[PDB]
Amino acid sequence: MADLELERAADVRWEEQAEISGSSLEDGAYRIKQKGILGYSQIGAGVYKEGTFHTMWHVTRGAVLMHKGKRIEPSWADVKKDLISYGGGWKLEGEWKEGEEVQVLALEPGKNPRAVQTKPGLFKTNTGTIGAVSLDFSPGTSGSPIVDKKGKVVGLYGIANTEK
């Protein structure tokens, strides 16, 4: 059994003094890490909202997560959408405007969380237009929350559904 733990990185809030363009228990953004022979390694990032932990399916792979002294366990997942919810139903209902700029709360493995302001690329699909946020970030940054102006989470770094 892999030893997967989550660690709180910071609060999830829109950053006003944020850098624009592209230079590349408790609510918040958590690093997802598993213990190794050398030490922990960061495989993903997760969002804690309304007592439910949201992350990419590929990061967790369905494995049980250790938070504090309590084991937090999966409730729902979608392998096609690469989404997994722990302890409750999916709580992130936030949608992108389709025109407004967004901030990515990045969590590079071994780097301070930073907010980066960027405009997602818009591409058509059979299920309706979608916004793509792609930047030069490590794989361990996967699941990093993408927030709108209101500060709600509109996507996870990996893919940003837009409703208008």
The one-letter code for the residue type at 154 is V
Identify which of residues 23 and 127 has a Cβ nearer to ligand I16 in the complex.
127
Residues making contact with ligand I16 (CB under 6 A):
58, 80-83, 92, 127, 155-156, 158-159, 161
Any idea which residues carry the catalytic annotation?
58, 82, 142
Least distance to ligand I16, CB of residue 67, Å: 21
What is the distance between the alpha carbons of residues 54 and 57, in angstroms, rounded to a whole number? 9
Least distance to ligand I16, CB of residue 90, Å: 8
Identify which of residues 58 and 152 has a Cβ nearer to ligand I16 in the complex.
58
Burial 107-141 (b: 16+ CB within 10 A, else e): bebeeebebbbbebeeeeeeeeebbebeeebeebb
Sign of CA dihedral 130, 97, 99, 144: negative
Identify which of residues 9 and 156 has a Cβ nearer to ligand I16 in the complex.
156
Least distance to ligand I16, CB of residue 79, Å: 8
